[PDB]
Enzyme design. Structure first.
Site, PDB file in Angstrom:
ATOM      1  N   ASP H  43      38.819  46.967  33.824  1.00  0.00           N
ATOM      2  CA  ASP H  43      39.064  45.739  33.089  1.00  0.00           C
ATOM      3  C   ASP H  43      38.027  45.562  31.984  1.00  0.00           C
ATOM      4  O   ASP H  43      36.987  46.226  31.958  1.00  0.00           O
ATOM      5  CB  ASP H  43      39.028  44.543  34.039  1.00  0.00           C
ATOM      6  CG  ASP H  43      39.759  43.339  33.491  1.00  0.00           C
ATOM      7  OD1 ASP H  43      40.140  43.360  32.304  1.00  0.00           O
ATOM      8  OD2 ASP H  43      39.945  42.366  34.251  1.00  0.00           O
TER       9      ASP H  43
HETATM   10  C1  LIG Z   1      24.881  28.461  35.344  1.00  0.00           C
HETATM   11  C2  LIG Z   1      25.891  28.430  34.201  1.00  0.00           C
HETATM   12  C3  LIG Z   1      27.324  28.260  34.699  1.00  0.00           C
HETATM   13  C4  LIG Z   1      28.342  28.424  33.574  1.00  0.00           C
HETATM   14  C5  LIG Z   1      29.785  28.297  34.055  1.00  0.00           C
HETATM   15  C6  LIG Z   1      30.776  28.688  32.962  1.00  0.00           C
HETATM   16  C7  LIG Z   1      32.213  28.287  33.285  1.00  0.00           C
HETATM   17  C8  LIG Z   1      32.879  29.227  34.286  1.00  0.00           C
HETATM   18  C9  LIG Z   1      34.390  29.017  34.346  1.00  0.00           C
HETATM   19  C10 LIG Z   1      35.102  29.590  33.124  1.00  0.00           C
HETATM   20  C11 LIG Z   1      36.579  29.207  33.082  1.00  0.00           C
HETATM   21  C12 LIG Z   1      37.433  30.279  32.409  1.00  0.00           C
HETATM   22  O1  LIG Z   1      37.563  31.336  32.923  1.00  0.00           O
HETATM   23  S1  LIG Z   1      38.260  29.948  30.831  1.00  0.00           S
HETATM   24  C13 LIG Z   1      39.720  31.019  30.711  1.00  0.00           C
HETATM   25  C14 LIG Z   1      39.972  31.366  29.246  1.00  0.00           C
HETATM   26  N1  LIG Z   1      41.347  31.775  29.026  1.00  0.00           N
HETATM   27  C15 LIG Z   1      41.792  33.081  29.474  1.00  0.00           C
HETATM   28  O2  LIG Z   1      41.035  33.809  30.018  1.00  0.00           O
HETATM   29  C16 LIG Z   1      43.229  33.530  29.243  1.00  0.00           C
HETATM   30  C17 LIG Z   1      43.450  35.028  29.078  1.00  0.00           C
HETATM   31  N2  LIG Z   1      42.174  35.710  29.192  1.00  0.00           N
HETATM   32  C18 LIG Z   1      41.964  36.973  28.515  1.00  0.00           C
HETATM   33  O3  LIG Z   1      42.836  37.440  27.864  1.00  0.00           O
HETATM   34  C19 LIG Z   1      40.623  37.697  28.623  1.00  0.00           C
HETATM   35  O4  LIG Z   1      40.595  38.743  27.694  1.00  0.00           O
HETATM   36  C20 LIG Z   1      40.417  38.273  30.021  1.00  0.00           C
HETATM   37  C21 LIG Z   1      41.760  38.601  30.666  1.00  0.00           C
HETATM   38  C22 LIG Z   1      39.663  37.266  30.884  1.00  0.00           C
HETATM   39  C23 LIG Z   1      39.610  39.563  29.910  1.00  0.00           C
HETATM   40  O5  LIG Z   1      40.376  40.472  29.176  1.00  0.00           O
HETATM   41  P1  LIG Z   1      39.930  42.055  29.151  1.00  0.00           P
HETATM   42  O6  LIG Z   1      40.994  42.882  29.829  1.00  0.00           O
HETATM   43  O7  LIG Z   1      39.788  42.505  27.719  1.00  0.00           O
HETATM   44  O8  LIG Z   1      38.616  42.232  29.872  1.00  0.00           O
END
Ligand SMILES: CCCCCCCCCCCC(=O)SCCNC(=O)CCNC(=O)[C@H](O)C(C)(C)COP(=O)(O)O
Ligand SMILES: CCCCCCCCCCCCCCCCCC(=O)OC[C@H](COP(=O)([O-])OCC(O)COP(=O)([O-])OC[C@@H](COC(=O)CCCCCCCCCCCCCCCCC)OC(=O)CCCCCCCCCCCCCCCCC)OC(=O)CCCCCCCCCCCCCCCCC
Ligand SMILES: CCCCCCCCCCCCCCCCCC(=O)OC[C@H](COP(=O)([O-])OCC(O)COP(=O)([O-])OC[C@@H](COC(=O)CCCCCCCCCCCCCCCCC)OC(=O)CCCCCCCCCCCCCCCCC)OC(=O)CCCCCCCCCCCCCCCCC
Ligand SMILES: CCCCCCCCCCCCCCCCC[C@@H](O)O[C@H](CO[C@H](O)CCCCCCCCCCCCCCC)COP(=O)(O)OCC[N+](C)(C)C
Ligand SMILES: CCCCCCCCCCCCCCCCC[C@@H](O)O[C@H](CO[C@H](O)CCCCCCCCCCCCCCC)COP(=O)(O)OCC[N+](C)(C)C
Ligand SMILES: CCCCCCCC/C=C\CCCCCCCC(=O)OC[C@H](COP(=O)(O)OCCN)OC(=O)CCCCCCC/C=C\CCCCCCCC
Ligand SMILES: CCCCCCCC/C=C\CCCCCCCC(=O)O[C@H](COC(=O)CCCCCCC/C=C/CCCCCCCC)COP(=O)(O)OCCN
Lengths: 124, 459, 103, 55, 70, 178, 84, 88, 128, 55
Positions: H43
């Site tokens: 991935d």
């Molecule tokens: C201590 C600090 C804490 C911080 C916390 C931060 C917040 C954590 C929670 C985050 C919430 C989310 O995931 S926000 C979610 C954002 N939206 C999406 O992920 C939709 C589709 N995602 C993609 O297409 C990406 O490319 C992906 C498949 C992930 C990779 O692809 P690869 O195949 O190219 O690796």
């Protein structure tokens, strides 16, 4: 701490303040009124030139300690009997200061009691 | 004194009959020789003065300034040797002639036992400077700078002539000895107030005072290197020397006529020190630093106490030497860079280490570091002003902090950091520039050993 | 995502040239050439030219020049106690008055 | 009976028994407690746990 | 000045016996000094002179008269 | 630093950068290795649960509260590598990097030492002198009309050709010149 | 004289999660249904001489035993010498 | 400092050592020229994790714009060598 | 829900918390393309002028010269006397002078009055 | 041993009317005690730097 808590939480006039003490004549307690003795004169204490704050009633033991330290110099811990004597004399001086504080406290207690009794007798 | 004036005059025929490729050597050698002759004047006595004749006299105030004036000329020649390479022989000889005439006028000015002769030479010192600024200047603003420098000075100094002739008509003599011995108090009247203003404004404009300093950044920026050093080192001291000479007849009016100028100087020192922080140019920054130091000297002279006068003389000499050194260093940078901008060339310490050392020493001296004579004069003036009023210490301390800040900012921006990538003409520093910096700095660290030679007559 | 073929080729050529340049930075055995030309013991000489000579010079300067002028070197007078003897006079300071000594 | 003792112990003793400000007393006591605390932090975080530096 | 010590890459680094015995000796010296001083000088921490109790002091030596004389 | 940037970052790039920053700050918070691994796996789990979302409006709606949550718990004193733009030794050796062209100003007495190095230097200078003349023409003929659109440079295409604008990338001083 | 000895890296199969507190992490991840791919990568921090750790108090009394023995010996010697 | 002059073969050995401990990929199948997205089916998040692992192991951190376009161990080795100025 | 980060003049809004790049429209992409285009044009010009073996000088920067000219020599010709400019000039150039004059005048008047009364204790004030 | 105290005013720098500035050194308890401590610490720090800053 207890005295500070008592003064800042109880009655201020109940017990003294360090700044204005003593508030009663020295002869109030007993009439013989013995005097403190000093065994070091002005001139020898001046020659020893101790300190202005070190020229107190325990100066003779301090002078003996200085003499002992100066005489047996290389063995820096040769003389400790006079060091302990000076500490004992300072401890006694602190005891006398505590005696003064408690004496003033009890004298003020009895003065307040006398004033209250007189006021009650006048009211009665 | 003629043992000094005559050789300076003979420098002109010496220069004009020299070979085309040996003018610089002869001028430098004989200027240095003249400086050695001028050293004899330094041995002043606690009594009145060295009254040479009816026309010239030397004091312990005139001696340090005279020695500095005679010493500056070889440095001016070594500084001008660089950018005059592609100049015709006649024009180079004319340049050296202008420098020699300037030195001669300054030498005749600083003794000048009579006040009218002093004024005549004090304005005569204005023509060679204007010619140098407007002729051998690079930028197109040299003309406006020359006009500003001429008119700011002349407008202030024109009422001085009327005041002087009036004083001669009433007092009967303008000889400084007679003026000092026969001095009488000035009554509080409108006429006396305007006499005070006329006699003071002519010297306050040249110092310069805050609010009349607009000519100085222009004159210092647009002038060539030699004009810059002669402006910052000696030409600024003419006003202070004249003021300390002429305040002998303005008492007791000064006691309350000094308030506007004291306030202006004590606030303008802070203003110009702050201005130095946000500057895109090096020569402008050095010029504003000179304005701040001269404002401090103005405060010292207006206080009128012995410590004030001693500190004023020490600060005069120290600031002259330091500003000349700083202008030299800026010119050496500009010759390689051809831009004259502070942030265009950076990290030069990695490429030129010895010039970085000279920069550090000059900045430290400008920073008023002990036990240099800079701090001696500074501290004397601080103590005198504190005696004048306890609240001046706030302004003086603020000035000191800002002075340190902008001095180290000037050092750090041009010396520390990563070098600029697209500059590849930073040739190794010549022996001429290193010798110039050494000859600038060594007299300061030598005078810090014998301060009494520069502490003035009230020592 | 990833490298484009042009990027890969350019990076490869740049890497080759960079490695060649870096290899060229090495110094050979004869690369550094210096032209020669001339015109307990270590500590023993060190203590002589660095410690003894300054002591001599400073002692001379203080003894015969600094102390020549009055009040240049002023020493705090030594403490005098009961019982000591003074070299200059020979007199003996009287002792204390025999304070009561318990513990 | 270490080098810091002969100074700091007397400092605290003299500070405790002088006609001084009480808030300064409390601040000094909390300060020496925090001194012990950050010394503990240095030792524990730099000499006790499992290694965390690069391989 | 020292000896050749080579990197290990995920193993415990080489330890010479010199540093181990030196560190152990100096820690032992510190602890022995502390124990010896505590044995000889116990009053430096525990105190040497008892703190008087002011409540136990009788009114005779404090110059207090029984509320009637004055 | 090497690669030229694009005009904008795609949603995937934003998500990956947020993931890297979140993992770095979580490692900074969780000092020990086992705790870091446990909470990194938990964060990966909570990060991939929205991997397969299809609509872009909701995905952009996410990664906003994610950034706010990251900013709220960002460990105001994160761990920075010593050579990073925030590290303790970021530009420590930038005062030792002397440019190559400085060697052109050396005195002949100084150039007497290291003769082989200066011979190779002359060879490199000749190589650059010819390569520049070739590269200027290659870049002139390769760029589209109206000026370049991105700061990516093409490689060398012929046999004897060299990549355009290579001299100041090849002759970097060093990582630690002294 | 520099560090040139052609160091050889160990075999990658040596590092195992066994005998390390990474079992607890793996077990609590499996309870909620995941695994840590990088578990073995840090096993070296718990495998070799780093396996044994010392508590803070034990760290403070680094040389208590030797110092106590020397102190007892010195006290006994002083007792037997002064009693003379 | 006394830091040994790390060389290309040492860098490659370290890279393969780090990768072989990543249990998501089998050690036998991986090669110095093997890809990540296609040849190993990893991935994007997994690739970010490998990049961070090499970051931690080598003591220097890779910028995101350069880390997101490294897909083979060979080009990772080349990038590290270019960063650290390795001759051979 | 988490407490919001309120930006100020000396603590600007982070790019990640900024909402401008989340409301993306084709014109925004076009604008970013033009910005990158002009930036790359300038970079290409600089690099062409920078790697030239024949060049043995300083690459003149029009931006730096323009900035210096705007800062130094273009202030007065664009200056107009307006109520804001006039008020700011009067205040910042007059108020401090009179404030300091009043302070020093009051201090010196008090000192002189104390001197006249003689209750100042000027003993040992030899140097002045 | 004795309690020696001394001030040395060797070089007379300059006199300003009734004020005299001279190169004066004070060698009281504070100076004579702080010279060896500073020199000892500096010696140890220099020996440490001979190893820390070898590159
Ligand atoms: C201590 C600090 C804490 C911080 C916390 C931060 C917040 C954590 C929670 C985050 C919430 C989310 O995931 S926000 C979610 C954002 N939206 C999406 O992920 C939709 C589709 N995602 C993609 O297409 C990406 O490319 C992906 C498949 C992930 C990779 O692809 P690869 O195949 O190219 O690796
Ligand atoms: C501390 C006293 C020491 C006395 C020993 C004798 C020293 C005589 C020096 C006389 C003046 C120096 C000449 C100036 C230019 C230097 C020439 C040069 O280019 O150097 C290259 C040369 C060779 O190096 P290189 O590798 O070839 O060049 C590479 C780069 O240059 C890279 O260069 P770098 O990185 O090596 O740095 C160059 C170095 C050298 O450059 C300088 O900055 C030197 C100038 C420092 C003064 C700064 C101005 C402040 C005003 C002070 C005025 C005091 C002067 C007194 C009389 C001086 C007589 C000439 O700069 C510094 O190290 C920083 C100096 C800051 C010191 C701040 C402390 C000042 C006050 C200290 C007390 C002074 C009075 C004491 C009173 C009480 C005690 C008795 O290096 C030197 O020669 C160094 C000289 C030693 C430094 C002296 C600094 C303090 C001494 C000041 C005067 C001594 C007072 C008398 C006390 C005696 C007891
Ligand atoms: C030596 C060390 C450093 C010291 C030197 C530096 C500091 C000293 C020198 C610099 C400061 C001196 C400036 C004071 C006078 C200069 C004003 C001037 O030349 O007028 C040119 C300029 C020529 O007028 P304009 O070009 O025909 O009209 C352009 C405006 O858009 C038309 O404006 P508008 O019609 O919309 O409003 C004007 C009106 C409204 O005024 C206001 O907005 C507020 C009232 C402010 C003044 C009253 C308090 O003004 C009044 O009614 C007040 C009259 C009294 O007049 C103004 O624009 C300013 C008008 C307001 C005067 C304020 C001056 C008071 C300063 C304190 C004394
Ligand atoms: C070991 C020694 C250490 C100390 C050495 C000190 C040397 C000092 C040398 C520097 C002197 C500085 C110049 C002083 C000039 C001022 C005095 C001068 O004007 O006096 C003139 C006299 O000057 C001398 O005659 C000539 C001195 C000029 C030369 C000085 C020595 C160094 C010259 C170096 C020149 C270049 C050397 C060669 C280079 C190639 C006229 O005197 P006059 O007004 O009638 O006297 C009247 C009183 N009388 C009657 C009692 C005499
Ligand atoms: C701008 C950059 C700096 C330039 C130079 C600035 C310095 C010039 C300022 C002039 C210094 C003071 C001038 C007058 C001082 C006398 C004191 C007087 O002003 O105070 C009152 C005087 O009252 C009024 O001030 C009368 C004068 C009012 C008219 C003068 C103009 C005021 C504003 C003009 C400012 C313009 C300055 C710049 C011009 C280009 C006291 O009243 P009184 O005790 O009874 O009279 C004292 C004099 N006696 C004793 C001889 C009789
Ligand atoms: C050195 C090599 C030679 C060694 C052999 C000689 C040894 C000493 C013999 C010389 C005789 C002593 C001597 O030099 O004469 C005294 C002579 C001064 O003469 P005075 O009359 O006492 O005072 C000046 C007013 N007339 O003293 C000296 O100059 C030598 C010692 C002075 C101290 C050294 C300089 C250190 C300070 C440098 C200046 C720093 C700035 C000023 C400090 C600020 C202080 C507030
Ligand atoms: C950088 C620009 C600076 C400009 C400086 C210009 C201002 C200088 C100060 C005023 C100059 C003129 C003063 C006159 C010269 C002094 C002569 C004198 O003192 O004689 C007076 C005469 O006094 C005068 O005539 C003064 C008249 C002034 C007329 C010209 C006015 C010029 C401008 C005045 C205001 C300027 C003051 C502040 C200027 C600040 C700088 C801008 C005595 O008169 P008697 O006849 O002897 O009377 C005795 C019997 N009762």
């Amino acid at each position: 701490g207890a005295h500070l808590a008592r003064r800042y939480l109880g009655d201020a006039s109940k017990e003294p303040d360090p700044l204005r003490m003593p508030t009663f004549p020295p002869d109030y307690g007993f009439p013989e009124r013995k005097e403190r003795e000093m065994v070091a004169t002005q001139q020898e204490m001046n020659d020893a030139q101790l300190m202005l704050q070190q020229r107190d009633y325990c100066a003779h033991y301090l002078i003996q300690l200085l003499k002992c330290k100066r005489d047996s110099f290389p063995n820096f811990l040769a003389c400790k009997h006079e060091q302990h004597d000076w500490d004992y004399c300072e401890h006694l001086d602190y005891v006398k200061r505590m005696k003064e504080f408690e004496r003033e406290r009890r004298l003020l207690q009895r003065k307040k009691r006398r004033e209250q009794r007189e006021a009650e007798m006048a009211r009665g | 004194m003629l043992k000094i004036i005559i050789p300076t005059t003979m420098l002109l025929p010496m220069t004009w009959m020299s070979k085309h490729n040996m003018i610089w050597i002869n001028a430098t050698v004989h200027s240095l020789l003249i400086s050695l002759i001028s050293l004899s004047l330094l041995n002043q006595l606690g009594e009145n003065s060295l009254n040479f004749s009816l026309t010239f006299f030397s004091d312990s105030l005139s001696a340090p300034l005279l020695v500095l004036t005679t010493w500056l000329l070889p440095l001016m020649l070594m500084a001008s040797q660089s950018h005059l390479s592609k100049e015709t022989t006649t024009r180079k000889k004319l340049y050296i002639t202008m420098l020699i005439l300037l030195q001669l006028f300054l030498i005749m000015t600083f003794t000048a036992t009579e006040l009218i002769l002093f004024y005549i030479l004090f304005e005569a010192t204005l023509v060679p400077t204007l010619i140098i600024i407007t002729r051998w200047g690079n930028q197109t603003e040299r003309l406006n700078a020359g006009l500003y420098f001429l008119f700011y000075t002349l407008a202030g100094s024109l009422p001085l002539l009327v005041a002087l002739v009036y004083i001669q008509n009433t007092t009967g003599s303008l000889n400084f000895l007679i003026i000092h011995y026969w001095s009488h108090p000035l009554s509080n009247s409108w006429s006396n107030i305007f006499m005070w203003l006329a006699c003071i404004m002519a010297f306050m404009v040249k110092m310069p005072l805050y609010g009349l300093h607009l000519w100085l950044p222009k004159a210092h920026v647009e002038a060539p290197i030699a004009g810059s050093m002669v402006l910052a080192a000696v030409l600024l001291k003419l006003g202070g020397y004249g003021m300390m000479r002429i305040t002998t007849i303005l008492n007791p009016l000064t006691n309350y006529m000094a308030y506007p100028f004291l306030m202006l100087s004590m606030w303008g020192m802070i203003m110009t020190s702050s201005i130095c922080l946000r500057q895109t140019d090096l020569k402008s920054l050095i010029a504003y630093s000179s304005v701040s130091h001269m404002a401090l000297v103005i405060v010292a002279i207006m206080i009128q106490t012995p410590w004030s006068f001693m500190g004023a003389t020490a600060l005069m000499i120290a600031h002259g030497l330091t500003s000349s050194m700083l202008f030299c260093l800026a010119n050496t940078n500009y010759e390689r860079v051809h831009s004259r901008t502070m942030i265009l060339a950076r990290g030069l310490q990695t490429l030129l280490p010895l010039m970085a050392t000279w920069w550090l020493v000059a900045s430290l001296t400008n920073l008023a570091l002990p036990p240099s004579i800079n701090l001696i004069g500074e501290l004397f003036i601080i103590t005198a002003s504190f005696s004048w009023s306890n609240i001046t210490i706030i302004l003086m301390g603020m000035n000191m902090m800002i002075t340190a800040l902008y001095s180290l900012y000037m050092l750090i921006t041009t010396q520390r950091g990563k070098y600029t990538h697209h500059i590849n003409n930073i040739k190794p520093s010549f022996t001429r520039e290193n010798a110039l910096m050494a000859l600038h700095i060594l007299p300061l660290l030598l005078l810090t050993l014998n301060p009494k030679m520069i502490l003035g007559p009230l020592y | 995502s990833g490298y484009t073929p042009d990027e890969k080729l350019r990076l490869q050529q740049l890497r080759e040239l960079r490695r060649r340049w870096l290899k060229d930075q090495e110094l050979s055995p004869r690369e550094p050439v210096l032209p020669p030309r001339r015109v307990t013991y270590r500590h023993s000489i060190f203590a002589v030219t660095h410690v003894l000579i300054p002591v001599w010079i400073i002692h001379y300067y203080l003894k015969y020049h600094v102390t020549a002028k009055p009040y240049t070197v002023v020493e705090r007078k030594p403490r005098i106690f009961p019982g000591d003897t003074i070299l200059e006079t020979g007199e003996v300071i009287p002792l204390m008055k025999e304070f009561p000594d318990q513990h | 009976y270490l080098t810091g003792f002969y100074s700091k112990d007397l400092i605290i003793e003299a500070v405790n028994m002088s006609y001084t400000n009480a808030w300064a007393l409390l601040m000094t006591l909390i300060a020496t407690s925090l001194t012990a605390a950050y010394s503990t932090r240095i030792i524990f975080f730099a000499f006790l746990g499992k290694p965390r530096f690069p391989p | 000045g020292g000896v050749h010590i080579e990197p290990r890459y995920r193993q415990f680094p080489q330890l010479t016996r010199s540093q181990l015995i030196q560190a152990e000796f100096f820690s032992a010296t510190m602890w022995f000094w502390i124990l010896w001083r505590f044995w000889h000088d116990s009053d430096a921490v525990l105190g040497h002179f008892p703190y008087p109790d002011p409540s136990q002091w009788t009114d005779e030596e404090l110059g207090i008269l029984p509320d009637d004389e004055d | 630093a090497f690669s030229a940037p694009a005009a904008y970052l795609t949603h995937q790039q934003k998500v990956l950068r947020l993931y890297k920053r979140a993992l770095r700050h979580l490692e900074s918070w969780c000092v020990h290795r086992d705790k870091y691994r446990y909470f990194a796996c938990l964060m990966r789990a909570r990060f991939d649960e929205h991997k397969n979302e299809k609509d872009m409006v909701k995905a952009t709606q996410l990664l906003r509260q994610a950034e706010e949550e990251f900013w709220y718990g960002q460990h105001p004193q994160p761990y920075i590598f010593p050579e990073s733009p925030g590290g303790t030794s970021y530009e420590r050796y930038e005062c030792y990097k002397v440019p190559e062209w400085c060697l052109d100003d050396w005195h002949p007495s100084e150039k007497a030492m290291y003769p082989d190095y200066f011979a190779k230097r002359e060879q490199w200078k000749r190589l650059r002198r010819e390569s520049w003349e070739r590269e200027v023409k290659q870049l002139q003929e390769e760029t589209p009309p109206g000026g370049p659109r991105t700061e990516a440079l093409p490689p060398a295409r012929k046999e004897g050709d060299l990549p355009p604008l290579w001299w100041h990338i090849v002759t970097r001083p060093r990582e630690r010149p002294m | 004289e520099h560090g040139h000895s052609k160091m050889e890296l160990p075999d990658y199969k040596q590092w195992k999660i066994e005998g390390t507190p990474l079992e607890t992490v793996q077990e609590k991840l499996a309870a909620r249904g995941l695994r840590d791919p990088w578990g073995r990568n840090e096993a070296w921090r718990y495998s070799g001489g780093f396996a044994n750790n010392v508590s803070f108090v034990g760290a403070l009394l680094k040389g208590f035993k030797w110092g106590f023995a020397a102190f007892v010996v010195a006290v006994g010697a002083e007792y037997y010498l002064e009693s003379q | 400092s006394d830091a040994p002059p790390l060389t290309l073969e040492a860098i490659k050995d370290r890279v393969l050592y780090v990768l072989k401990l990543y249990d998501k990929i089998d050690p036998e199948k991986l090669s110095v020229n093997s890809h990540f997205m296609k040849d190993l089916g990893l991935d994007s998040l997994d690739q970010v994790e490998i990049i961070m692992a090499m970051e931690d192991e080598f003591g220097f951190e890779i910028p995101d714009i350069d880390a997101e376009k490294l897909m083979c161990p060979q080009e990772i080795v080349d990038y590290i060598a270019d960063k650290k100025d390795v001759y051979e | 829900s988490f407490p919001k980060y309120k930006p100020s003049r000396l603590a600007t809004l982070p790019a990640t918390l900024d909402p401008a790049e989340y409301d993306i429209s084709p014109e925004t992409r076009k604008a970013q393309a033009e910005r990158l285009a002009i930036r790359s044009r300038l970079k290409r010009e600089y690099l062409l002028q920078y790697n030239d073996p024949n060049r043995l000088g300083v690459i003149e920067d029009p931006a730096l010269i323009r900035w210096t000219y705007a800062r130094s020599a273009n202030i007065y010709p664009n200056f107009r006397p307006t109520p804001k400019t006039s008020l700011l000039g009067a205040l910042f150039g007059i108020g401090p002078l009179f404030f300091w004059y009043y302070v020093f005048k009051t201090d010196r008047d008090k000192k002189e009055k104390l001197i006249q009364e003689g209750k100042l204790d000027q003993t040992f004030n030899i140097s002045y | 041993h004795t309690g020696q105290e001394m001030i040395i005013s060797n070089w007379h720098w300059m006199t300003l009317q009734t004020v005299e500035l001279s190169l004066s050194f004070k060698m009281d308890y504070f100076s004579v005690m702080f010279i060896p401590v500073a020199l000892f610490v500096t010696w140890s720090i220099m020996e440490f730097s001979m190893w820390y800053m070898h590159s």
